């Protein structure tokens, strides 16, 4: 196969423009073309072999500019291309892909906490708003299972949330699901087998090392083995049936730690370190550059 874990942007003292790719097969890191604009609180995703960086903000010494940007990285060219901008800036965004379409979920613009959701069509290079969430959510976790979109936890500006909701695309409708056992803002949210996982995040007191998973058949959340490191604002992705969490913040350090969850053994292990500690990255998986 030859797939890599791509980490784009993130935060250490200011927003970063780094694009770096980890190869699970050999433990190597490649530095690739920098983002055109520094970004943190962005999400990453892949459609048709292309890496997309969505939303976030540029938190610089001179400014905090919330991002409406969609930018596309082609591993074949090692080049970033601007795409159509979203309706609204969305810092601390959540993203998921259904049937080749990018869903942009919630996030902040200054003191505004979005419930709005919009869907990108890569071939037409267009965004359109779809039904808003039932809840204003920033730092929201998003994943896709069986062509249904899940929005998990976050922050409404008053309360960190344990709530979650599911979007039924054929009905353009959101419905609440069972809440998580734990309040989580800025958790890593991904799908593995028939479950939605929520790893780490921030409960309004501490960065979390707990991980819980939602079984879509049974509609329950169950804790699994905790991560070795407490982390908020972590990157997450799935590669060859294992969860990878990248960086984040433990209340003391910007982590370079990358941990890997094996669902067969219910254990986490340390598999590599990023080249530098950072939080708020976008992460996704695709083919290695040329």
């Amino acid at each position: 196969v030859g797939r890599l874990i791509y980490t784009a942007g993130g935060y250490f003292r200011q927003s970063l423009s780094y694009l770096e790719a980890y190869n699970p097969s050999n433990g190597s890191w490649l530095r690739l073309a920098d983002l055109q604009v520094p970004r943190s609180g962005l999400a990453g995703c892949v459609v048709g072999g292309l890496l997309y960086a969505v939303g976030g903000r540029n938190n610089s010494p001179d400014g905090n500019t919330d991002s409406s940007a969609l930018d596309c990285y082609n591993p074949m060219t090692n080049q970033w291309s601007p795409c159509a901008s979203m309706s609204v800036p969305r810092n601390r965004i959540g993203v998921g892909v259904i049937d080749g379409h990018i869903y942009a979920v919630g996030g902040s613009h200054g003191c505004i906490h979005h419930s709005s959701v919009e869907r990108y069509e890569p071939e037409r290079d267009e965004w359109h708003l779809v039904a808003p969430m039932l809840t204003r959510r920033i730092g929201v976790g998003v994943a896709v299972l069986n062509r249904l979109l899940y929005a998990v936890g976050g922050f409404d500006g008053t309360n960190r949330l344990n709530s979650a909701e599911c979007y039924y695309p054929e009905r353009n409708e959101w419905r609440m699901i069972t809440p998580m056992n734990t309040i989580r803002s800025g958790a890593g949210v991904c799908v593995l087998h028939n479950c939605i996982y929520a790893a780490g995040g921030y409960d309004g007191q501490d960065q979390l090392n707990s991980v819980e998973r939602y079984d879509v058949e049974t509609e329950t959340w169950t804790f699994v083995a905790p991560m070795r490191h407490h982390r908020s604002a972590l990157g997450i992705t799935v590669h060859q049936g294992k969860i990878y969490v990248l960086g984040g913040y433990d209340g003391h350090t910007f982590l370079d730690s990358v941990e890997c969850y094996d669902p067969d053994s219910d254990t986490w292990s340390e598999v590599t370190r990023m080249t530098s500690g950072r939080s708020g990255v976008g992460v996704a998986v695709t083919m290695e550059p040329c």
């Binding site: 960190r160 209340g251 939080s279 708020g280």
Partner: peptide, 9 residues
Amino acid sequence: INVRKRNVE
């Protein structure tokens, strides 16, 4: 009431 600590983006 809650807190947040350092900046994370």
